[PDB]
Design brief:
The complex is a heterodimer of chains A (493) and B (505). With 493 residues, chain A is mainly α. Chain A has two domains: 310 residues, ABC transporter transmembrane region fold, CATH 1.20.1560; 153 residues, Rossmann fold, CATH 3.40.50.300. Chain A has 19 helices and four strands. Chain B has two domains: 290 residues, ABC transporter transmembrane region fold, CATH 1.20.1560.10; 190 residues, P-loop containing nucleotide triphosphate hydrolases (Rossmann fold), CATH 3.40.50. In chain B, 61% of the residues lie in helices and 6% in strands. Chain B has a five-stranded parallel sheet. In chain B, a hairpin with a 2-residue loop joins strand 4 and strand 5. Classes of the chains: A mainly alpha (493), B alpha/beta (505). The interface between A and B is large, with 119 and 113 residues. It is classed as transport protein. The entry lists the keywords ABC transporter, Heme, transport protein. It forms a dimeric assembly.
Chain lengths: 493, 505
């Protein structure tokens, strides 16, 4: 039981009715094309031995109807298969997001927010792509292979074995070899690829002081040599991809040669029409196979995406009182924020209580690209505009709000990019002020702030009567504590 | 051998179809000779076609790798010129390009270019051969062929109103989803933890129906291509069968036309299938090419006279004479790194013109000018490796011992287990920030240079080391060199004979 299979049933199975609908439409389209080829050969051969024009009427009407049906059914099948795959992906995304809303402290924090997007965006696309390049190619290919082997088998069960062996060889060995070559290419020489992140991340932010000296061209030579080595290694590893590229043509050639050889020794036995059909079908039965040179590649990509999706320190205890001020500081490498969430967890006491007491405010808080009113009512949606304006003025955003064309209704396209970093942290501080949590926990609230303001904001926040008054607890995990100050110190290790 | 290989493939497809049709016609009419020549001809035709396909694959792989390498090298070289004004803005794009961002051009060079070349070669040649064997089927196919562009243009012009609206709704809703999923941890530690689950439901519903509309509009091209490439064969078959029943056309010609219609109509379908997989590579190539042509370095050949020149800034009334210590003070980020990098001549001077030794920097010969100078930047050069090499990238050090003694690098080299041989990581890993700065002074202060520029020389340094480096810099200035810093601290301010107060705006 591989994780891909586990995730397949996990994703709320795609409502198999519309899976089989797409499979049937694809089989109908490709079988219609194959039957058009066969009926075409039969019509030509029958018209050769001069008959009266009575059966040619039904043969001709069948030919024209089959052509038009092939076109329209191909289009409809493409639409239906895409519909099924993308509906499945959407429901899987909704379910996975639902699972990311659980009370216990799951991996929902052990991961950042940007790469959480980098998962939830591409992973659902990959899972959709495993329903377009695994339903269609494999299912339609096996059905059409069976239906085209049987037609030759009933005529003669002697060359049908060769056709089946050849179809299996093409449609299995060729994509398997292509996938293996592609996989082995991108992992081979995974040490000269370090030179990419060495040079391109060396001589792209370090350009001027490299340019003043004559060391630029030395770097150019020293990474070009290793890039060339990587290219040679990748070529050597991906050489067996050309064999897989050329295999289907050799398959078709062997198939048609075998068909002609078999038809030579069976022409006098049967009618001319059957001989022509047996001779001309093999060259037109390989259209389904060519649709899956990437099906194995898509399988590998979806497998790695499924593994990535499946992938989805202790601190001391500190006693707290309702109204104390803490100035927790520590070196880079200490669980200061982890201590913050530990205090929040022990204060909240897990689920079972409605009036949540402690809520951590991380520095990397996302900024919604909505109106400022909506962006600020996330913590509390029952705050009047007067309170928001007063908070913005008291944190240093009255002048920023005054220039806004829509006031509090500014949409702020792009999220955090719509405002400055200091402005964004000011909005975060205002949001923390708005929230009515009995215990408020801050994580570096004085970063990226103004030089003449950050000290004052830190002083006011850690003052028990400047911004948060009396019964409100403020815990700050900062790095710029003033040399002369107060409040207890819980310096970690 | 691209065009040669494609010509070989086209020839061995057309000839294989013709030979097969003739063999079938010959051994249907006479079911009693032709087995030896024709069969061997067909076998060798298929064999050479296979060999040509494999050789084409290898050649395309090699060519794509070479093109990727050359393009990456050219992009990196071009972006690394002077004028860091554009560099600070396009470094993200350049870093994206020389990364797993150009590997998407491999499909463009693998499955699209050979497809379009084969479409351009095989289709007219197969049309010619079919016309030679039978002109009515060729006429039908020809009438069909300029009916793909007409219908495609008609469809894409009649319905070019819903596609744009559907795409706009698609991208807006997708951005809504991406930003909402981006902020889930923020909404986790508040009261509203699961109240947003309902919104994603109909947001997904609307996004998926919008993408349904755009997919329904955008597939019509495939429908048109399939319908025409199939109706062509259907009509060819009907015509050949209906006009062959009156004993007035050889079976071989009919079979040849019937077998050659799919060869005419296939490469266009292959190109259409392979097109959608090459849009990303073309975009990456366009982005890479858009950032190469613009830079064109200028400057003159004037040579500053021997000695330490006089630098003057009329805009800020700052004229700095040789042999003295100068400091710059002001707020953070008011064109001071820009001023320095301008007096290195990399970019234009924001604050008026700058005259070196009486002559403007625009007429300066930068090659010789850069050799008279010790430029210590905020972040020194720290290539992964050892300490010894990192001390030698910025040119050879003629007298590293006394410079290290003056700055105090010996206490750094002394504590290192291997002396100047301890391994050093990327960006300074295994090497302390203030001790990184000390390495910077070691590489900078020790150099033959009559002009000294330093940006905050006392970063991450204690009082004793600050005093030592200030004394060393003062001694270097007394050695007859123009030394200018930008330090904005009391020890730095009270260490230079002149103070410049460059202001904003």
């Amino acid at each position: 039981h591989d994780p891909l299979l586990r995730l397949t049933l996990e994703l709320l199975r795609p409502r198999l009715g519309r899976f089989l609908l797409a499979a049937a439409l694809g089989v109908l389209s490709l079988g219609s094309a194959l039957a058009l080829a066969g009926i075409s050969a039969w019509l030509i051969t029958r018209a050769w031995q001069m008959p009266p024009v009575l059966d040619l009427t039904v043969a001709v009407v069948a030919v024209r109807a089959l052509g038009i049906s092939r076109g329209v059914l191909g289009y409809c099948q493409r639409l239906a298969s895409h519909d099924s795959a993308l509906r499945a992906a959407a429901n899987a995304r909704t379910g996975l997001y639902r699972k990311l809303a659980d009370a216990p402290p799951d991996e929902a924090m052990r991961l950042p927010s940007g790469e959480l997007v980098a998962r939830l965006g591409p992973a659902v696309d990959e899972l959709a792509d495993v329903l377009v390049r695994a339903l269609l190619p494999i299912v339609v290919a096996v059905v059409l292979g069976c239906a085209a082997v049987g037609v030759i088998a009933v005529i003669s069960p002697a060359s049908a074995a060769v056709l089946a062996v050849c179809l299996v060889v093409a449609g299995v060995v060729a994509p398997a070899l292509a996938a293996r070559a592609a996989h082995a290419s991108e992992t081979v020489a995974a040490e000269h690829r370090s030179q990419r992140d060495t040079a391109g991340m060396l001589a792209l932010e370090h350009a001027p002081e490299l340019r003043v000296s004559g060391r630029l061209d030395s770097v150019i030579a020293t990474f070009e040599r290793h890039h060339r080595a990587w290219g040679e290694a990748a070529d050597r590893a991906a050489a067996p991809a050309a064999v897989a590229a050329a295999m289907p043509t050799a398959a078709m050639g062997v198939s048609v040669v075998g068909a002609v050889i078999a038809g030579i020794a069976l022409a006098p036995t049967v009618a001319p029409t059957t001989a022509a059909i047996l001779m001309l079908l093999p060259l037109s039965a390989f259209e389904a196979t060519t649709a899956l040179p990437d099906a194995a590649a898509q399988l590998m990509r979806s497998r790695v995406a499924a593994r990535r999706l499946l992938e989805l320190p202790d601190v001391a205890t500190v006693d707290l009182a309702p109204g104390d001020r803490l100035a927790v500081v520590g070196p880079s490498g200490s669980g200061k924020t982890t201590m913050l969430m530990a205090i929040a967890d022990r204060l909240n006491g897990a689920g079972g209580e409605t009036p949540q007491r402690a809520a951590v405010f991380a520095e990397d808080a996302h900024l919604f690209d909505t109106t400022v009113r909506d962006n600020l009512l996330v913590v509390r949606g029952d705050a009047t505009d007067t309170e928001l304006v007063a908070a913005l003025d008291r944190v240093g955003l009255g002048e920023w709000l005054a220039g806004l064309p829509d006031g509090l209704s500014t949409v702020l396209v792009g999220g955090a990019a719509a405002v400055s970093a200091g402005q964004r942290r000011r909005l975060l501080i205002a949001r923390a002020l708005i929230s009515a949590f009995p215990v408020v926990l801050l994580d570096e609230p004085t970063e990226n702030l103004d030089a003449g303001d950050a000290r004052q904001m830190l002083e006011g926040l850690l003052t028990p009567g400047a911004l948060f008054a009396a019964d409100r607890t403020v815990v700050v995990a900062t790095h710029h504590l003033p040399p002369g100050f107060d409040c207890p110190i819980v310096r970690c290790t | 051998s691209y065009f040669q290989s494609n010509v070989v493939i086209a020839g061995c497809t057309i000839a294989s179809a013709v030979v097969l049709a003739h063999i079938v016609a010959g051994i249907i009419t006479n079911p009693a000779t032709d087995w030896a020549p024709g069969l061997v001809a067909l076998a060798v035709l298929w064999s050479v076609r296979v060999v040509a396909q494999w050789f084409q694959g290898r050649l395309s792989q090699r060519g794509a790798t070479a093109v990727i390498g050359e393009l990456s090298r050219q992009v990196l070289s071009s972006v690394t010129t002077s004028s860091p004004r554009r560099l600070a803005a396009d470094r993200d794009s350049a870093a994206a390009v020389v990364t797993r961002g150009l590997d998407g051009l491999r499909p463009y060079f693998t499955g699209y270019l050979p497809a379009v070349v084969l479409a351009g070669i095989l289709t007219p040649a197969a049309l010619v051969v079919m016309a030679a064997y039978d002109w009515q089927a060729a006429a039908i196919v020809v009438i069909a062929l300029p009916l793909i562009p007409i219908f495609m243009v008609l469809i894409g012009l009649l319905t070019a109103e819903r596609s744009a609206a559907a795409l706009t709704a698609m991208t807006t809703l997708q951005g809504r989803m991406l930003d909402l999923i981006a902020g889930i941890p923020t909404l986790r530690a508040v009261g509203r933890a699961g109240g947003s689950v309902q919104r994603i439901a109909e947001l997904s519903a609307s996004h998926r129906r919008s993408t349904m509309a755009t997919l329904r509009i955008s597939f019509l091209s495939a429908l048109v291509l399939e319908l025409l490439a199939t109706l062509g064969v259907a009509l060819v078959a009907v015509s050949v069968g209906l006009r062959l029943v009156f004993g007035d056309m050889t079976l071989a010609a009919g079979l040849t036309a019937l077998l050659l219609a799919p060869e005419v109509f296939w490469p266009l379908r292959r190109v259409g299938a392979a097109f959608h997989a090459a849009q990303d590579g073309k975009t990456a190539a366009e982005q890479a090419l858009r950032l190469c042509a613009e830079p064109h370095p200028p400057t003159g050949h004037e040579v500053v006279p021997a000695g330490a020149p006089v630098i003057e800034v009329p805009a800020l009334k700052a004229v700095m004479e040789p042999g003295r210590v100068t400091v710059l003070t002001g707020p953070n980020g008011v064109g001071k790194s820009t001023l320095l990098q301008a007096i290195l001549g990399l970019q234009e001077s924001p604050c008026g013109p700058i005259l070196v030794a009486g002559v403007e920097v625009g007429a300066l010969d930068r090659s010789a000018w850069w050799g008279r100078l010790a430029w210590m930047p905020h972040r020194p050069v720290l290539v992964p490796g050892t300490v010894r090499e990192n001390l030698e990238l910025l040119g050879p050090v003629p007298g590293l011992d006394e410079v290290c003694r003056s700055v105090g690098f010996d206490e750094v080299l002394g504590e290192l287990p291997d002396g100047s041989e301890t391994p050093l990581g990327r960006g300074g890993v295994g090497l302390s920030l203030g001790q990184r700065q000390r390495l910077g002074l070691v590489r900078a202060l020790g150099a033959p240079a009559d002009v000294l520029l330093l940006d905050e020389p006392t970063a991450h340094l204690d009082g004793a080391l600050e005093d030592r480096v200030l004394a060393a810099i003062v001694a270097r200035a007394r050695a007859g060199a123009t030394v200018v810093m930008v330090g904005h601290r009391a020890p730095v301010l009270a260490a230079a004979d002149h103070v410049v107060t460059m202001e904003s705006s």
